[PDB]
Design a protein around this ligand. Structure first.
Ligand SMILES: *CCC(=O)Nc1cccc(N(C(=O)OCc2ccc(F)cc2)c2ccnc(Nc3ccn(C)n3)n2)c1
Length: 304
């Protein structure tokens, strides 16, 4: 009852692309921003390149496996790998970085229409991961990337695990995890809903750290004690009551991603009835460095 994963893994010559600037250095590797210029095709494709540095290659290649198996407007997909001495993952460049940082660097210009539309898009992406039976296990506003202020995508599948047709792990992010995942290291699609709740909360609070100033070990108890994160100031009880349901302890009485889409979509139809924000404002649109006449976004570059 398990279908054959016929995704293509595309191997790309290191010649076809040019690094341009370090986006980040995490010791395991370095992520560059560059251009991908396929050979004799007259397109430049803005990309991010992550090269490892180990026996950590099993990790970077597992991520490429996941990222090559996902095709959705609200998930990041792998463009290809390059098998140089350093193995390199290539993906679409998300020009505006992660949502977490974006929400902080722009609090004074983020309206309710944006916040609620983001909540819909993350839910759509997560629901699609559900369809493909994938459990993210690391949903957080920092693992949501911003292609335009109007358009975000879920990212970071390092931890991600494909279920069959209830994943048992054994380094984690505790403040975003369902109770089950703390105590039993179980991860479900409903485990992802809990983390989704925390992510919505990050966005409403414009990037506050969940349980700031609390030591991680205590968190399991205070959650069993019936405690949760505070109602955000911009948040009507309508919004916050959705957040709170994501944090119920019976994981099956939590909401499904397809329901979070409907609910937040209904709210995004009348944003100011649901989020109260002083002065509901506008947000930006990018050639940057090199002659850019033939630049094509990854989402418009489809070799089948
Ligand atoms: C909110 C947390 C955060 O800042 N994350 C962050 C910082 C810097 C760079 C990125 N990446 C990234 O992690 O990509 C890794 C990767 C995985 C798989 C693959 F095939 C290639 C690369 C990232 C990815 C895509 N686009 C951007 N863009 C970006 C980031 C910061 N700025 C200004 N632009 N980053 C994530």
């Amino acid at each position: 009852g398990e279908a054959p994963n016929q995704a293509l893994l595309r191997i790309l010559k290191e010649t076809e692309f040019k690094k341009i600037k370090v986006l980040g250095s995490g010791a395991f590797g370095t992520v560059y921003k560059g251009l991908w210029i396929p050979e004799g095709e007259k397109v430049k494709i803005p990309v991010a390149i992550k090269e490892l540095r180990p026996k950590a290659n099993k990790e970077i290649l597992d991520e490429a496996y996941v990222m090559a198996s996902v095709d959705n407007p609200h998930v990041c997909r792998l463009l290809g790998i390059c098998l140089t001495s350093t193995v390199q993952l290539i993906t679409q460049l998300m020009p505006f970085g992660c949502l977490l940082d974006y929400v902080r660097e722009h609090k004074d210009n983020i309206g309710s229409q944006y916040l609620l539309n983001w909540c819909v898009q993350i839910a759509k992406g997560m629901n699609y991961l559900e369809d493909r039976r994938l459990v993210h296990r690391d949903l957080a506003a920092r693992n949501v990337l911003v292609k335009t202020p109007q358009h975000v995508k879920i990212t970071d599948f390092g931890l991600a695990k494909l279920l069959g047709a209830e994943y048992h792990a054994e380094k984690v992010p505790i403040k975003w995890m369902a109770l089950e995942s703390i105590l039993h290291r179980i991860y479900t699609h409903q485990s992802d809903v809990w983390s989704y709740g925390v992510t919505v909360w990050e966005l409403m609070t414009f990037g506050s750290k969940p349980y700031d100033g609390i030591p991680a070990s205590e968190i399991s108890s205070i959650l069993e004690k019936g405690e949760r994160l505070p109602q955000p100031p911009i948040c009507t009880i309508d919004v916050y009551m959705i957040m709170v349901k994501c944090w119920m302890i019976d994981a099956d009485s939590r909401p499904k991603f397809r329901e979070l889409i409907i609910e937040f979509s209904k709210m995004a139809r009348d944003p100011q009835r649901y989020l109260v924000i002083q002065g509901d404002m506008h947000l930006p649109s990018l050639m940057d460095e090199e002659d850019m006449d033939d630049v094509v976004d990854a989402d418009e570059y489809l070799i089948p």
